[PDB]
Design a protein around this ligand. Structure first.
Ligand SMILES: Cc1cc2nc3c(=O)[nH]c(=O)nc-3n(C[C@H](O)[C@H](O)[C@H](O)COP(=O)(O)O)c2cc1C
Ligand SMILES: Cc1cc2nc3c(=O)[nH]c(=O)nc-3n(C[C@H](O)[C@H](O)[C@H](O)COP(=O)(O)O)c2cc1C
Lengths: 210, 210
């Protein structure tokens, strides 16, 4: 249905927030899996990979989401899916699994893992929750950007969305409480129109050389 | 020699944290401005573009940065530059400038601008500082990811860095106090080695279909 793109600069420069999608185009399980695999290649602090996703694409899921998305119902209804991005406050719990996997795949020495897992755990035991949260938001921002661009590599488009009932969404989809920080929604689908161009500030307004 | 790339998947898949750079490669102010122009095409809440940058590339600047960077000295010393990323807590103050420019450049009808600006201003009037900061952290993540990928399009590489004296960097570089949230440092330069591959979690461990 969609055109694969490879040109980095067209993928980046041509990205806009697209609010209207083709309601007859759906993204397959395997293609969404690939898009997410490609997106999650992003970096994160100590490779903790705190990002978590709901791929809301079923009729019943769209129905549950719609009431929560405020003023953003066109994106929610017409989209192939809405990807709900969260940060996991328990992200450091995966460290042993991540570093164990690095060891198993030949990518990290055992001795290195033996030393850095307790070292990193130690550091994070003395980080306030507010600091950890700030770090998880930055990293979730990172993966969300790469996701938007990966979407366009696959011929899709997206709209990052903050206008939704963030405090209701976890419970609405059966997620455990007090764990998952809502980051954004991201609609994804085949664009049916070009969107609208927008301005950016001149660089001399926002950067200083030192 | 530094070599540009066009292929999106090679730019993304090939991105690692590079910690050692060619000390004889420097990035011109011209090329760095073009890199930042391309990175800042990133989206942000209400297009408020809250990100701000210090391009620390001078001998004096690098000497000023070094004592604040901890055990990330190899990156700071060898890199062509370190880009210090901040979020401006007064970002909304540029809203009218941003939207006025859209009208001037014919990208937005005045009608639309005259309705959207006051509505947006009203909305952010009832957003507390803590929620504004979260939003600015997310957007600063967004632009920082795009900056890493754009660097590789130009033949460079980066390392995102959180291990620095965040509380001290604004004052060290003469920035207005109590305004700019430190996001990260990002070393940039020509890679002199490939770095280390790293693992990512299985998608079905971090994503759920609904
Ligand atoms: C985190 C975030 C939240 C956003 N919230 C909404 C939203 O709720 N609804 C919407 O239509 N657009 C939303 N926007 C889209 C912005 O308005 C858009 O990125 C900005 O106007 C620049 O336009 P562009 O994406 O087409 O380049 C959001 C963008 C971001 C990054
Ligand atoms: C926000 C942020 C802060 C980071 N802090 C550091 C740092 O202080 N020093 C460092 O060497 N790497 C730092 N990293 C790099 C991570 O360790 C790295 O991204 C992760 O191990 C995955 O490896 P990769 O980027 O090569 O794919 C940071 C990454 C991010 C995104």
């Amino acid at each position: 249905t969609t055109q694969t793109a490879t040109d980095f600069m067209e993928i980046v420069k041509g990205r806009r927030s697209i609010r209207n999608y083709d309601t007859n185009v759906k993204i397959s399980k395997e293609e969404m899996t690939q898009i997410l695999e490609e997106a999650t290649l992003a970096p994160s602090s100590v490779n903790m990979q705190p990002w978590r996703f709901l791929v809301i694409d079923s009729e019943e899921g769209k129905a549950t989401l719609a009431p929560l998305a405020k003023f953003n119902q066109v994106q929610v209804e017409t989209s192939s899916a809405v990807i709900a991005v969260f940060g996991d406050m328990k992200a450091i719990d995966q460290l042993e699994n991540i570093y164990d996997t690095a060891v198993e795949k030949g990518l990290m020495p055992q001795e290195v893992r033996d030393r850095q897992v307790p070292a990193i755990q130690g550091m994070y035991e003395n980080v306030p929750a507010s600091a950890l949260k700030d770090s998880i938001l930055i990293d979730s921002g990172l993966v969300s950007m790469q996701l938007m661009l990966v979407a366009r590599a696959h011929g899709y488009d997206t709209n990052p969305i903050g206008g939704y009932e963030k405090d209701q969404i976890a419970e609405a989809f059966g997620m455990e409480k007090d764990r998952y920080v809502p980051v954004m929604l991201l609609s994804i689908g085949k664009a049916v129109d070009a969107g609208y161009p927008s301005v950016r500030l001149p660089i001399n307004d926002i950067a200083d050389w030192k």
